[PDB]
Enzyme design. Structure first.
Site, PDB file in Angstrom:
ATOM      1  N   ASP A   1       4.820   2.669   7.354  1.00 54.43           N
ATOM      2  CA  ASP A   1       4.325   3.817   6.612  1.00 54.43           C
ATOM      3  C   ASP A   1       4.639   5.149   7.288  1.00 54.43           C
ATOM      4  OD1 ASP A   1       2.765   3.136   8.827  1.00 54.43           O
ATOM      5  OD2 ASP A   1       0.916   3.893   7.953  1.00 54.43           O
TER       6      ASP A   1
ATOM      7  N   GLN B   1       0.846  -1.197   0.000  1.00 52.40           N
ATOM      8  CA  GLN B   1       0.000   0.000   0.000  1.00 52.40           C
ATOM      9  C   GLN B   1       0.883   1.250   0.000  1.00 52.40           C
ATOM     10  OE1 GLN B   1      -2.242   2.581   3.149  1.00 52.40           O
ATOM     11  NE2 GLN B   1      -3.182   0.555   3.145  1.00 52.40           N
TER      12      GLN B   1
ATOM     13  N   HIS C   1       1.351   5.742  -0.213  1.00 53.82           N
ATOM     14  CA  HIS C   1       0.833   7.072   0.066  1.00 53.82           C
ATOM     15  C   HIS C   1       1.006   7.866  -1.235  1.00 53.82           C
ATOM     16  CE1 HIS C   1       1.805   7.000   4.687  1.00 53.82           C
ATOM     17  NE2 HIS C   1       0.660   6.404   4.404  1.00 53.82           N
TER      18      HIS C   1
ATOM     19  N   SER D   1       1.543  -0.221   4.834  1.00 51.03           N
ATOM     20  CA  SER D   1       0.198   0.285   4.691  1.00 51.03           C
ATOM     21  C   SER D   1       0.408   1.764   4.417  1.00 51.03           C
ATOM     22  CB  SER D   1      -0.592   0.087   5.980  1.00 51.03           C
ATOM     23  OG  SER D   1       0.037   0.752   7.056  1.00 51.03           O
TER      24      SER D   1
HETATM   25  K     K Z   1      -2.138   3.582   5.352  1.00 52.68           K
END
Ligand code: K
Ligand code: CNC
Ligand code: CNC
Ligand code: K
Ligand code: NH4
Ligand code: NH4
Ligand code: NH4
Ligand code: NH4
Lengths: 137, 551, 178, 551, 137, 177
Positions: free
Chosen positions: B335, B141, B143, B362
């Site tokens: 993250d 995942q 950003h 994440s």
């Molecule tokens: K996240």
């Protein structure tokens, strides 16, 4: 009652998936969208579908996930704005026991959301005990 | 007189990090704290009367929620009697099936399960995570944000992230009112990078829900929960408000998970003298109780609290393990910035990277950290080449792949033109060709033309206030000559109708194919079994830039 | 001791004021923010930025919660303009607007370590600008990827300490800025 | 038109590293190569007639040596028929005792055992290493050298290394003729840092043996062996000459191990089309066959070869595992530079650090790498603080500890005056008080006064040509007012007389207490068993500089 | 025979480690070294000690290690410079079959290093086959 | 083609010479060192450093082994002074002394990438200095912790290629520049 074998619905039983207005997964093509034969009102997940997924989650050994899908099935009937109203009402120091109980009654009577209605009544009772009702802060 | 040796060491980046000595009274201890409750369970007529030494008469909302919905009371007492060391042994034993584990762990109390994983060192924890991870295939995942909430940049970076391999991407705003724009840009870019990439926009709860209702997001992750009642309160929710919110997201056909993480209670003032691990355990169970399929944990945004104390990073892996063991999808943090040291952050990352989790990170920053609106990720755009190299070095699938500049440039451009057409169609503040080309070759906002924030902010709010939904985006794309992208946007919308992607760990790969823990069950059974990097994927991982042929 | 509590703060009657709501330990148990800037200098500059716009500034101390969002909300309830400014002893600041959800805002400054006295003047100015129902350009976004790595642990500790002065049910107290 | 994103990535240090595409023909492939032989064993009348598809008629010196001495032929055919996947599973199964494994592994052929570990990913390999490691307690080894072969510096740095936790330290020369000085310096400093720290001086075989004969070394490690006959020949030995040399060191009461490592055959021109792991396996078996107790492997000085190809670092851990599994002490490299990236090198180190090995690093540079005469270590003096931090983060015993400048300075000083007294006594080119204080506060040779190399080189060779032994050093120390250090050196001498430390993984801790695999048997049996960081050691690891008491 | 239960010798059975002068590990103090009652000639590991360790290694399941210790016990009797001579003799292209066989006889008859003598004869035979004798380069 | 093979090299008569022994591919299959320096420039500078000391320089090509140590040894046995200089095509250099163990030496330069033409002149002069049985200050130690990270793989490849020109039993050949 569907099971893991029946999943993914989109792949195994696409016909099992029909929308609110009653359109097929295939009917949602760019064209039907540009000609408005399908609109935002036809694109909402039905309580039937959500209940088929709760069945599959239960078969996959995930009871709480199924329970969540159950409640969700009940909420598909609650208007967007009403959902937001309910949610906010459950946040700390927002409501009075009465208002919550009132929300419950509406859920049960107007939406037939028995599961969600009890969830709210349970919160109401506990909110009194743990002081999270309006005026408790 | 100064020792030159220590002066050289004093200048070291790691010495800029924040370190503290355990403060047990305020819960400033990662795990294994003496104030933590001993595991216990007392059930009467199918209802818990005692939970981890605490009598029901004293239950707070968390205790109540957990006791009533979070524990399988049918096997609860049986498991409680089992030896915690034996159980921890079963977690890392390559020959004890995950399917044999779950029935036991999902019957444990918060203290019980914490006691179990605490008997483990990080190597045993990783050995267990590779087996407990719900989805067989690991994922990532990223950003996708920037300090200017610039929509053109977001669309381009999102397209690249998607191209590099991220199956879930997340954006957020510096200026709240910008949200609608970020969300749409993120969603448009992602689909151009790879149709199926799920997208989210992290905002205040009520606000994020409406944005999902308008059709500008694919899922929601930062749906927070907390370890103590007073902190949950300042979080502005209760176990019930969040449980309700979880069912609301599902009723709209949107996949979601909660977000928690060790150290949040400490960061917010009320740890109630408990260790970060115990409190996080309560969050993990809050999540299970609510019926939420997954959880984003591993300290996440408060990574600076447990990492400041002993065994902090070991605790972070332990909470990820508690999560997976509880049969929940786990987006394992990695993250957030917590150190000035590359060595240190690498060690923290490998804990999840090596064994693999549903989402190794994440929130790996797909943009340079100066643009990361979550105040910095544990990895960012500049680490891309190193990440692909470590994958090659250890033959470990980190979920990403080496990419060609020419391809990136193209995809980034197509994403800028696509969004441009979307903005023109919906009659939003125009995206000029300069902005498009700028976004095509940028590394961050520093390379982007300044936009009229006041104007965008206006039209951004209008999308909300006038309930402008995602259909307007699909049409703008179609009439803008992006039939393919419009279809893709449509297909993602069709996924919400079927509900398949609402299941544990679900992501959409290939041609709109859901990949979850249901149809991609992790079947780890020791060496030469379970997920293994190989075939074309391995070939993809091997071909990194700079690899010369000796011939 | 530049702050003096003068009875329960009352709701504002005219829209030409902006309330500055500060944590229960602001100017008391703690006197400087996370990076050493004195509370007195901070408030002075915030006040200055507000008046500098032709708006009155009214300072109150909240006790119901140490969380900056709620501190600001307690304040926007009493603000004649509906606009308020929350500030924790450690420095964190937010521009709130009566009617918005608690955890929502007009402008937020999530990294206390990066705020300077000029920044605090800017905050007070934009607040006063929002009180005049204008649409000011947001104060430039400050973001330091190493902010947390260096100060999160300290931030948590300072907040832990300020939270000890939280009193449930205790309504805000207007303050006399000596 | 270039993408600023890739220009930023192009500047990254990791992209300065040397990467290449597999070259199967020249054995430029880490492991799992197609050219590698299939496991096989054919025994007739108690003698191997076929080893890994090769008939005895074609055996080269290595095959011969391995076939005759390296394989337990009693269970060889039995284990050959066992399933390699099953075996690999046993290695990482926390419930299969190390004692149950060894009888099987020491009965496998090079190809067989390689096939087994190749079924494992690095998480499984680490899970196995913590169980297979011979000594229960992990340890560390450091390099103590400098670009000027300056003896004052070495004694000082050596004392610090010993103070920081290194139980074995090694030095070498820029200019061979200097050796005697380096060796003495190292020996003297080490004993001041911590009596019991074993010392070695890596030189040409014959030369190093004489240095040990003269009493200026505690053990020897770089006693090389190679995977192919042609490369072994250029190494200037055979399996018999090295086996003889192994027994010669033992007859003098000196502990020793061989040194090998993946990639050397390739680096020296003759890989015979085999993979680095297969060839390294041969070296591991040559070591076993010779009767040598331990081995320094994991690519070591040729780290740049396997690291340039896919799964290279995973192969490095694999060979370390093959070593320990074969019941041999393993000094697991992590002593040589192979990358410009901190992220990359950290990943490489964690493979051995996390599970722990007899010597997590067989050469952590105790001096800044510009002084490292092994062309740079994977870690150096400037990483000390980060190493103690990661120990703290993961609650992993890395064998080192945080130290106080005040203490280091004192120890470094006592070591410089000690050596000064030794040089005065033996009548060697004097060490001025300037050099003493300089060495007390230096970080590297840059801070050291220039010495008369030509003069030292003379007296260095004199020590050899005139057979000046270590007793001269013991006496000079005694007469110099260093009775303590003199006895310490004598105590080290005592150890050679009793032979206890000649056993697998032996080191000397506390009060001249040997700690080996014999009296410190690794008893890993899953969570809560085997070695566990705890007690005072844990407290020692927790107390790093900068840990502010939250009050 | 020495068992693992007897290890560490220095700890369990110190008296088992004595010089051929009936000197004990304790007589090795700075004093006796400064007064020369103890010299470099008293500080060499005896074949007896090495054989005790071979026994222990055998008991520890390490036969190769014990074999190495046995050969070492044989070499304690060979002069430092002779050791160096033999080692070099075994390196690639250094000797002729005859010289190696000669070294072997010397080892066996002059030092009664039976085991090491055979080791060398084995090398000699293989060196012929593998071409590592002088002139083979 | 600056090098020409002039028959099997013979033992040196006078102690006034230093032998430069180069790999089987030096000046042939390979013409530059690991970092691009032309072999011709290197040899020229080493020769220069030798004669600049008043000593004669004799260049030979070894075939028995591509290993720099043995190449140097093959050379020190024909050297009238007993001192020789080994150099592999990739650049690695060593100052050997007849009578020393093959893998030992007087001075060694283990990081070819760091050698400059000035260094190669230094090499040649210290060698000539050793032939005069003097005790020259050793050529300053060059060490780069990143040398291997950047060049080991390349080094191995180059050596693999030069080794293809190794011929067992083939005695050294005298070379003409
Ligand atoms: K996240
Ligand atoms: C760590 C962090 C961050 N958070 Co939060 N957060 C958290 C955690 C700690 C917060 C706390 N109350 O202690 C955590 C997980 C609990 C949290 C929670 C939330 N956060 C939230 C949001 C939206 C945001 N958060 C950020 C500030 C987002 C930050 C990203 C960024 N741009 O900085 C962030 C990554 C880093 C801040 C930091 O460490 N600064 C360094 C520190 C030394 O300075 P400081 O001044 O002491 O930092 C404090 C403030 O940042 C404050 N704070 C953090 N989030 C918010 C949100 C709001 C609305 C307010 C008023 C204050 C905060 O808490 C920090 C510690 O006390 C945000 C910019 C990132 C994002 N877009 O997701 C965004 C604000 C958007 C805006 N308004 O413009 C939530 C509303 C999410 C939700 N699903 O409910 C929620 C609100 C909690 C609350 N009651 O305050
Ligand atoms: C990698 C390495 C190194 N080695 Co070795 N080595 C090795 C390996 C590769 C060498 C090869 N033959 O291909 C390896 C493991 C086989 C090895 C072996 C030995 N090495 C040895 C020694 C003593 C040394 N080695 C170093 C050069 C020690 C180096 C430390 C240092 N300070 O440089 C070193 C760490 C790094 C050199 C490098 O990669 N440079 C970068 C590369 C791009 O440049 P390059 O010019 O192509 O490098 C070549 C030379 O270094 C050469 N070489 C390496 N060691 C020696 C030793 C001698 C005597 C000679 C003549 C050449 C070499 O081989 C390299 C590649 O072909 C040394 C300074 C430090 C050490 N103790 O390890 C030291 C020399 C002492 C001195 N003369 O002042 C051995 C004699 C040890 C033994 N146990 O027998 C042995 C000799 C083997 C042989 N036949 O050449
Ligand atoms: K070493
Ligand atoms: N959220
Ligand atoms: N938490
Ligand atoms: N050696
Ligand atoms: N090797």
């Amino acid at each position: 009652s569907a099971r893991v074998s029946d999943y993914p619905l989109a792949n195994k039983h696409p016909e099992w998936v029909k929308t609110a207005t009653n359109k097929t997964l295939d009917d949602f093509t760019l064209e039907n969208v540009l000609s408005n034969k399908v609109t935002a009102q036809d694109m909402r997940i039905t309580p039937e579908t959500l209940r088929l997924q709760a069945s599959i989650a239960k078969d996959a050994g995930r009871d709480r996930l199924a329970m969540n899908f159950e409640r969700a099935a009940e909420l598909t009937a609650v208007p967007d704005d009403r959902i937001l109203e309910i949610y906010n009402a459950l946040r700390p120091y927002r409501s009075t026991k009465e208002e919550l109980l009132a929300i419950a009654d509406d859920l049960e009577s107007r939406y037939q959301a028995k599961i969600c209605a009890a969830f709210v009544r349970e919160a109401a009772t506990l909110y009194v005990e743990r002081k999270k009702l309006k005026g408790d802060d | 007189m100064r020792s030159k040796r220590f002066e050289a060491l004093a200048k070291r980046p790691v010495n800029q990090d924040g370190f503290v000595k355990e403060w047990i009274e305020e819960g400033f201890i990662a795990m294994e704290s003496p104030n933590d409750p001993k595991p216990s369970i007392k059930i009467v007529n199918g209802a818990v009367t005692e939970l981890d030494g605490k009598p029901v008469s004293d239950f707070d909302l968390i205790d109540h929620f957990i006791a009533r919905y979070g524990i399988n009371l049918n096997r609860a007492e049986e498991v409680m009697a089992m030896d915690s060391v034996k159980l921890a042994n079963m977690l890392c034993d390559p020959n004890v099936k995950r399917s044999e584990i779950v029935p036991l762990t999902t019957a444990m109390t918060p203290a019980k399960i914490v006691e179990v994983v605490s008997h483990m060192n990080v190597v045993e924890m990783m050995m267990a995570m590779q087996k407990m991870r719900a989805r067989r295939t690991p994922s990532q995942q990223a950003h996708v944000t920037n300090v200017k909430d610039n929509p053109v940049q977001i669309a381009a970076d999102a397209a690249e992230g998607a191209w590099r391999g991220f199956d879930e991407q997340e954006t957020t705003v510096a200026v709240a009112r910008y949200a609608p724009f970020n969300a749409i840009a993120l969603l448009v870019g992602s689909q151009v990078g790879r149709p199926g990439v799920l997208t989210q926009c992290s905002l205040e709860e009520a606000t994020e829900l409406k944005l999902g209702m308008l059709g500008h997001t694919c899922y929601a992750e930062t749906i927070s929960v907390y370890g103590t009642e007073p902190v949950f309160t300042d979080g502005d929710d209760t176990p019930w408000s969040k449980g309700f919110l979880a069912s609301s997201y599902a009723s709209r056909g949107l996949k979601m998970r909660f977000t928690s993480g060790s150290g949040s209670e400490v960061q917010m003032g009320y740890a109630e003298g408990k260790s970060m691990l115990y409190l996080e355990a309560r969050c993990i169970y809050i999540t299970k109780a609510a019926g939420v399929q997954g959880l984003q944990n591993g300290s996440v945004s408060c990574i600076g609290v447990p990492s400041a104390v002993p065994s902090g990073i070991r605790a972070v892996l332990a909470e990820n393990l508690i999560c997976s063991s509880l049969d929940l999808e786990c987006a394992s943090s990695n993250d957030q910035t917590f150190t000035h040291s590359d060595m240190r952050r690498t060690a923290r990352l490998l804990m999840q990277f090596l064994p693999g989790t549903d989402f190794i990170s994440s929130g790996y920053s797909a943009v340079p950290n100066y643009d990361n609106m979550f105040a910095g990720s544990n990895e960012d755009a500049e680490d891309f080449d190193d990440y692909n190299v470590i994958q090659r070095d250890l033959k470990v699938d980190g979920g990403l792949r080496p990419v060609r500049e020419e391809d990136v440039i193209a995809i980034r451009n197509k994403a800028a033109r696509a969004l441009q057409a979307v903005f023109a169609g919906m009659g939003l503040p125009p995206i000029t060709d300069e902005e498009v080309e700028a976004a095509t070759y940028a590394h961050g906002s520093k390379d982007m033309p300044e936009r009229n924030i006041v104007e965008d902010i206006k039209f951004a709010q209008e999308i909300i206030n006038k309930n402008r939904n995602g259909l307007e985006v699909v049409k703008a794309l179609a009439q803008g000559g992006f039939t393919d992208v419009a279809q893709d946007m449509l297909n993602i919308q069709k996924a919400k109708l079927t509900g398949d992607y609402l299941h544990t760990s679900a992501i959409i790969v290939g041609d709109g194919q859901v990949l979850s823990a249901v149809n991609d069950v992790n079947d780890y059974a020791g060496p030469a079994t379970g997920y293994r990097l190989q075939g074309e994927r391995w070939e993809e991982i091997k071909n990194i830039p700079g690899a010369l042929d000796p011939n | 001791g530049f702050l003096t509590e003068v009875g329960e703060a009352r709701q504002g009657t005219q829209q030409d004021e902006v309330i500055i709501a500060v944590g229960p330990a602001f100017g008391l148990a703690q006197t400087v923010n996370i990076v050493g800037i004195p509370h007195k200098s901070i408030l002075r500059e915030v006040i200055a930025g507000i008046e500098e716009e032709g708006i009155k500034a009214r300072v109150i101390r909240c006790f119901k919660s140490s969380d900056v969002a709620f501190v600001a909300v307690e304040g926007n309830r009493l603000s004649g303009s509906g606009i308020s400014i929350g500030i924790q002893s450690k420095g964190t600041t937010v521009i709130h607007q009566q009617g918005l959800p608690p955890l929502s805002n007009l402008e937020l400054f999530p990294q206390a370590p990066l705020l300077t006295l000029e920044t605090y003047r800017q905050i007070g100015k934009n607040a006063a600008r929002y009180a005049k129902r204008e649409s000011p350009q947001p104060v430039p976004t400050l973001n330091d990827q190493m902010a947390r790595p260096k100060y999160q642990a300290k931030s948590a500790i300072l907040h832990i300490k300020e939270t000890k002065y939280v009193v449930t049910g205790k309504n805000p107290q207007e303050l006399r800025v000596a």
